[PDB]
Write a protein that binds this ligand. Structure first.
Ligand code: CPM
Ligand code: ZN
Length: 307
């Protein structure tokens, strides 16, 4: 509340809280974290990215977004945890410090602020954005299906009322477009990670095509290692593979797009529980999830700095 050491990482928070948390963090470690606004949500809410850097001009960076799907609260929770973790581990953890000394980290905790606010105010299970209009009384698009990666292909719905509505056109959603422009403009992103929320999977590109990525051998081993690392804390078991192969076909996905942009280390993480609690994960599981997930993330980051 008053400082980042007082903030309760063991509970779920509102939009305001996370935003306030953002400012505390920047106030406390001004030389390491900066708060950037890459856009405004459909309902005009600021879209913020927290930039962790030790200097340099335009260093190779790591992209990390959480809460694209509003109801997946564990991700926003894990998001805030990571942010504090970055400030804590710099200069203490030999490996993490090595990473920050050479690369920057872009962390977007609340990728979909409108839906997030909605999950607090009216429907806890809301997952889409809150954009309106058309020949429909239904609101929102599935932000993870609005990307220009086999956009509109099988694995997404053209029906606005649908939970997996892809939107009118690729990048129609500001929350999405804001990232695209940011990342395209930066031009030196090396890794791109998108965090979900439930089923315990480590996925790597192509949800939209059966086509195998050229870097499949390498991506597969990294995922193997990441999953191995993650399970070392509490023995949480994750499955890994390509999207289409492990789950099902999905078009307009975040990770397919990033990979197509030449960002090789494109992985999607699906926390935490395999259905017992689902999207309504007990707050008591926040830390543990954050802790383990971090191990898998750092694994991937280490690979990145090394290749
Ligand atoms: C449980 S869920 N809705 N997070 C599953 C998440 C699986 C996915 C990962 C990457 C890319 C496209 C699809 C989705 O359907 O968006
Ligand atoms: Zn999701």
């Amino acid at each position: 509340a008053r400082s980042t050491n007082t903030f309760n990482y063991a509970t779920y928070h509102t939009l305001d809280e996370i935003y306030d948390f953002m400012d505390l963090l920047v106030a406390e470690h001004p030389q390491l974290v900066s708060k950037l606004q890459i856009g405004r949500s459909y309902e005009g809410r600021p879209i913020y990215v927290l930039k962790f850097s030790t200097g340099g001009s335009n260093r190779p960076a790591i992209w990390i977004d959480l809460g694209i799907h509003s109801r997946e609260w564990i991700t926003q929770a894990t998001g805030v945890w990571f942010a504090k973790k970055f400030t804590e581990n710099y200069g203490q953890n030999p490996s993490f410090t090595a990473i920050l000394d050479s690369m920057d980290i872009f962390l977007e905790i609340v990728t979909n602020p409108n839906g997030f606010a909605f999950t607090h105010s009216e429907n806890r299970l809301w997952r889409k954005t809150r954009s309106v209009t058309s020949s429909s009384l239904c609101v929102g698009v599935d932000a993870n299906r609005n990307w220009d990666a086999g956009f509109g292909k099988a694995g997404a719905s053209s029906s606005p009322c649908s939970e997996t509505y892809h939107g009118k056109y690729a990048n129609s959603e500001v929350e999405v477009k804001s990232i695209v422009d940011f990342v395209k403009n930066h031009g030196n992103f090396k890794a791109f990670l998108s965090i979900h929320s439930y089923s315990q999977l480590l996925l790597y590109p192509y949800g939209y095509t059966t086509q195998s990525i050229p870097d499949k051998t390498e991506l597969n081993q990294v995922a193997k290692s990441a999953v191995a690392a993650l399970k070392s804390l509490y023995g949480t078991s994750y499955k890994y593979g390509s999207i289409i192969t492990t789950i099902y076909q999905a078009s307009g996905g975040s990770i397919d797009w990033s990979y197509n942009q030449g960002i090789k280390y494109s992985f999607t993480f699906e926390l935490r529980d395999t259905g017992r609690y689902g999207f309504l994960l007990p707050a008591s599981q926040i830390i543990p999830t954050a802790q383990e997930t971090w191990l898998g993330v750092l694994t991937i980051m280490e690979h990145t700095v090394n290749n």
